[PDB]
């Protein structure tokens, strides 16, 4: 497609932003919210015509070493209040009602920063979270408990940098600094049962805690994709898109170009590199990207400003799919990008505390 | 060496065959995603939202923090009171670990990564650090290999053509990349055939 800068809003605190996300829990025609996270700031916004933006709410905490560098959205199932959730280097997750503008619910179980979050794309109460504590976790928020932990003996021998739920919510990937990539599942007997039990807990009716059902064993591992740290990674149906600081996104799958994904077992040691979307000038880590709800498009940023947006369909994909978009104004570095629920919109914040609201033809 | 030449040369052929195969696969994959994300649309369309509005409270906000923002666009600078949040007490730092009751053995080895990452905040680590990890791994680092990977089909075809143009090449190629070092896994895959 063809986009166009129609606003470059900027903040005053002047520390870098790290994170940006839309709320894909809009209603049909309900106007468009997004949100942002920085050095002690949560910042919300709303998207108006002509690149117009109405700032809505901003939030802070008192500590200084904190730096919120994640965000993600969900909703209370019971009461339909949207929720936002944030976390970073101080090492705590917390939840935000913008409805009530109160930090309603926090979680502390991590040893370090909390470099990502998600929500299980079916059930909103499952909050994955990944950390710089060589660990993943999976919280349940409505009942205020932990479910599961992913790591320890088997693999994440170094900090983690990302993770993803697949489009169904029956499987998950993780993405570490030890030149690795791993799977986990959620569909199993053990794991699913644990989740269900977590729903059915009450601390006031036991002398005996929840049994956080640990899992040391990944269902697949691999280190043969990359040569370098791994910034983020994403699903593409049953393909794995993973970047690095190698000036190239990769697409891949485990084993052969024909073996099923569920037929894989932990002994599986082969891989399948079958796609490579190349770009240039990335030499720093924690450089995310994303995909639309449709997985019809792919964003990306760069350490100078140079976007790149590979139209996914009809891709070679190595030979084709490039499409830069630039202004020489944010000479600084773009971390993270994001599309709306539709492919109407793009944002890309950057190290100089900027915003850049790109929009398409029609 | 000409090893890399033959690598790319055989790459082209395997790529062509597998390309037609996998582009059919990609098509099916787009279809997979299509129905899946369709399901997600369905459940999206069956639930309500309570969208967001600005601050309307007119009580208890006199003389404190507020936030604002500039633009390279003809718009006003908009100042809003900057809410603050009830702090939570943190906990010290842990790097996770495994319980255990009796001692355990591991004969660890060379360039095993988790390649160290001390930081990029204070001199980007200590200049000496280069020699540090080079000493540790004896100059061996994960994925320092000339080519991208080692995969069975490519491995096999390369071994075959290297012979056509067991050990004089097996041991050498194992020396080239850290996948094997010596032809141990090489001759393993040779015995697979």
């Amino acid at each position: 497609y063809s986009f166009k800068c129609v606003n470059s809003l900027k903040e005053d605190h002047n520390q870098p932003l790290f994170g940006v996300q839309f709320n894909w829990h809009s209603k049909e025609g309900d106007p468009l919210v997004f949100a942002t996270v920085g050095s002690n700031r949560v910042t919300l916004y709303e998207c108006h015509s002509q690149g117009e933006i109405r700032l809505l709410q901003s939030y802070v905490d008192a500590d200084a070493d904190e730096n919120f560098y994640t965000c993600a959205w969900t909703y209370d199932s019971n009461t339909s209040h949207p929720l936002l959730a944030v976390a970073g280097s101080r090492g705590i997750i917390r939840i935000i009602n913008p409805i009530t503008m109160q930090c309603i619910k926090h979680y502390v179980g991590h040893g370090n920063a909390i470099n990502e979050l998600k929500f299980h794309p079916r059930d909103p109460n499952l909050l994955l979270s990944v950390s710089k504590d060589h660990a993943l976790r999976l919280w349940n928020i409505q009942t205020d408990t932990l479910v599961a932990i992913f790591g320890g003996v088997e693999g994440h021998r170094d900090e983690v940098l990302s993770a993803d739920y697949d489009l169904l919510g029956e499987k998950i990937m993780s993405c570490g600094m030890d030149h690795s990539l791993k799977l986990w599942r959620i569909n199993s007997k053990r794991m699913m049962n644990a989740i269900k039990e977590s729903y059915d807990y009450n601390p006031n009716k036991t002398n005996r805690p929840f049994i956080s059902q640990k899992i040391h064993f990944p269902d697949f591992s691999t280190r043969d994709i990359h040569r370098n740290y791994v910034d983020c990674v994403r699903w593409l149906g049953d393909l794995i898109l993973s970047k690095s600081c190698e000036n190239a996104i990769v697409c891949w799958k485990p084993g052969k170009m024909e073996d099923d994904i569920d037929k894989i077992k932990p002994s599986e040691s082969n891989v399948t590199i079958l796609g490579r979307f190349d770009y240039s000038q990335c030499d720093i880590w924690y450089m995310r990207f994303s995909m639309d709800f449709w997985q019809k498009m792919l964003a990306l940023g760069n350490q100078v400003g140079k976007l790149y947006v590979w139209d996914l369909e009809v891709e070679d994909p190595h030979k084709a799919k490039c499409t830069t978009l630039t202004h020489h104004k944010c000479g600084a570095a773009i971390r993270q990008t994001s599309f709306s629920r539709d492919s109407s919109i793009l944002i890309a914040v950057c190290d100089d505390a900027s915003i850049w609201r790109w929009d398409r033809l029609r | 060496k000409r090893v890399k030449s033959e690598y790319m040369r055989l790459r082209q052929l395997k790529r062509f065959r597998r390309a037609d195969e996998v582009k059919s696969m990609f098509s099916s994959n787009r279809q997979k995603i299509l129905e899946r994300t369709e399901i997600l649309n369905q459940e999206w369309k069956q639930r309500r939202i309570q969208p967001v509005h600005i601050l309307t409270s007119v009580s208890s906000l006199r003389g404190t923090r507020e936030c604002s923002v500039t633009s390279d666009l003809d718009f006003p600078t908009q100042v809003i009171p900057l809410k603050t949040l009830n702090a939570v007490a943190s906990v010290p730092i842990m790097y996770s670990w495994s319980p255990l009751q009796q001692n355990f053995m591991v004969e660890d080895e060379t360039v095993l990564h988790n390649i160290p990452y001390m930081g990029d905040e204070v001199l980007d680590q200590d200049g000496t650090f280069i020699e540090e990890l080079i000493k540790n791994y004896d100059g061996k680092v994960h994925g320092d290999r000339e080519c991208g990977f080692i995969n069975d089909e490519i491995f096999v075809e390369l071994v075959n053509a290297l012979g056509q143009y067991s050990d004089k090449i097996f041991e050498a190629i194992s020396s080239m990349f850290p996948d094997k070092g010596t032809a141990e896994e090489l001759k393993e895959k040779y015995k697979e055939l």
């Binding site: 030499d283 880590w285 924690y286 350490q303 190290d351 | 990029d120 980007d124």
Partner: peptide, 13 residues
């Protein structure tokens, strides 16, 4: 050689 010498960093200058 270069990247084995040229480690990572989350920022520049």
């Amino acid at each position: 050689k270069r990247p084995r010498l040229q480690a990572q960093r989350k920022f520049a200058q």
